[PDB]
Amino acid sequence: AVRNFTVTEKGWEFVWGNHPPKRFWAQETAPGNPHGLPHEVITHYYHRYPMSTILGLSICAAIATVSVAASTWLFCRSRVACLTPYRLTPNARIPFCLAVLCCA
Amino acid sequence: YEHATTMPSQAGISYNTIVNRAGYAPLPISITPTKIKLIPTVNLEYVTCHYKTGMDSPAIKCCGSQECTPTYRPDEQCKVFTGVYPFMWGGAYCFCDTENTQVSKAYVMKSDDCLADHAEAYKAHTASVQAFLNITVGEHSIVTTVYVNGETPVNFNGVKITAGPLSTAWTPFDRKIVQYAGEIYNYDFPEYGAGQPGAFGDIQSRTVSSSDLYANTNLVLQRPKAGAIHVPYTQAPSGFEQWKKDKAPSLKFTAPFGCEIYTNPIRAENCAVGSIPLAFDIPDALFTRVSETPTLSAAECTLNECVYSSDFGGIATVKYSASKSGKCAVHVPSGTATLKEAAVELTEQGSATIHFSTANIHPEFRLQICTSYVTCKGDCHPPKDHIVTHPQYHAQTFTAAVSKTAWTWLTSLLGGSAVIIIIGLVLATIVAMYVLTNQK
Ligand SMILES: *[C@@H]1O[C@H](CO)[C@@H](O)[C@H](O)[C@H]1NC(C)=O
User: Fold this and answer.
1) Is the CB of B34 under 6 A from ligand 1?
2) Which one of A22, B101, B279, B317 has the fewest beta carbons within 10 angstroms of its own beta carbon?
């Protein structure tokens, strides 16, 4: 037979027939390389510490997306609020804002 | 001097601590629990073994009738069968074809081997803890079997140690246990006088040599075969042997926390649970003033080797310029690293090597020596072995294995987004102020 068992840092022992019990402990070794490209880092910190990377990576991605969307929203609102006072002039003369910031 | 420390109850792993005073040299205290025992108080409820059905020789009355002698023995039964015609090697026993009677009588006794092959049913409660500690304080080393109740001190060289009480009241044995063949089983055996046929405790004795015996084996008497002298009976098969067929593994194979179950006395050893609180009362004689002890100066720590393995997978070399030779109680106040040595020899000038175990990929701790506080940093690498045969000496912090590239990426994602938000807020405020001031 071939039997696989999961050994963690807490410990794990087996008794095979009349042999004395043998104890084994896991050890943080593999796989991947934390001092490398993002995919290797994610692989290393997913195989080790599972469910603490999937949660953390998702939280970070959500925060980044919300921040980017909010920044874009504020930038567009600022552009509208700085252009419409100059934009809806009947002759539409807009030199000052375009010269000081190039909003358009 | 009084100290109150707490050490994990992990057998075979040394634990080092340092004691500091305002004007006294630091002193190292090393405790090594070689064996931690847990001995519940047990009461012998009863003893069960294989039974033996004993039959009295049939009472054959020819051309007559008999009566049932009243019952006085364990599971004892008597019955009179009429119309029997027994035979022997000589020939027919009775001369009447009918109206002959045979009294059959059976009972239950302990087997002849109950003195050796028996199982003892115990009630287990009130666990007590003892610890075999190698204790080294002030270069004074002893071995003591200290009780882990908070009431009893142990004294040596004016030093008092009060251990316990244990942090956790957990025990592997439950209320009712069964000892058989040097193994302990968590079995809910029936109470004395409540045994059932074909199950454990179907016959019960208060003691292996006791004169009492409760028997309940569903013994019944069948009619003897025609022309035969014997006592037929029908019983539920032995409950002890059936229990031995379906014991399930003992406690030494099914106990949590790696406990090792032993008998005589019934105890659990080396349970990796809880923590022992130690209270120290140290006389001032062992303490030495700062002037007497060597004072360290011009010390630098270099991590010439580090692997974050379970064992001491790191070596730190410290360059020192000490006032005089002596002993330093080398210690790391933080939990970053665990030091193999609680004390190090010190010379006038040179380099000292210290073996440490860390779980940090990028360690940086404040190594304390006789008086100095060196700041020691470096890098560690994953070890060769996927699996080892010893528990981890160090402790795992939440941010232990997090590298530095992960910090850079996390700060860029969490910290760059905040920068973008700040930029957007500043731009919005500037635009609003500009338009508001340009209305008038
Ligand atoms: C504890 O002391 C005993 C008695 O000398 C010794 O045999 C044993 O090796 C010591 N334990 C350790 C871990 O050094």
Assistant:
1) yes
2) A22
| Interface residue B417 vs chain A (CB under 8 A) | yes
Q: What is the DSSP letter of B129?
A: E
Residue B288: count of CB within 10 angstroms of its CB: 16
User: Would you say B122 and B177 are in contact if contact means Cβ atoms under 8 Å apart?
Assistant: yes
User: How far is the C-alpha of B239 from the C-alpha of B242, rounded, in Å?
Assistant: 5
Instruction: Check CB contact under 8 Å for B310 and A23.
Output: no
Q: Which residues contact B25 (CB under 8 A, 6 or more apart)?
A: B287, B288, B289, B290, B292, B293, B329, B370
* Size of chain B in residues: 440
- Give the three-state DSSP class for B382: coil
CATH architecture of B288-377: Sandwich (2.60)
CA B18–ligand 1 middle distance (angstroms): 21
For ligand 1, the distance from its centroid to the CA atom of residue B25, given in whole angstroms, is 27
| Ligand 1 center from residue B134 Cα (angstroms) | 7
**Chains A, B: CB contacts under 8 A, how many?**
104
Tell me the HSE value of B421 on the side-chain side, using a 13 A CA sphere: 13
Query: CA nearest A24 in B: which residue?
Result: B389
In B, minimum Cα distance to A23 occurs at B389
Closest by CA to A44, choosing from A28, A59, A58, A60, is: A28
Q: How was this structure determined?
A: cryo-EM
Q: How far is CA B183 from CA A55, B119, B249, in A?
A: 46, 10, 9
| Residue from B42, B199, B198 nearest B121 by CA | B42
Resolution, in Å, please? 4.0
Token pair in block for residue B235: 């019983």
Nearest CA in chain B to A77: B428
**Contacts by residues B233-238 (CB-CB < 8 Å, ≥ 24 positions apart):** B233/B53, B233/B55, B233/B104, B233/B106, B235/B53, B235/B197, B236/B197, B236/B198, B236/B202, B237/B198, B238/B50, B238/B51, B238/B198, B238/B202
Identify all chain B residues contacting A99, using CB atoms and an 8 Å cutoff.
none
The C-alpha atoms of residue A51 and residue A53 are separated, in whole angstroms, by 5
Q: What are phi and psi of B142, to 5 degrees?
A: -140, 170
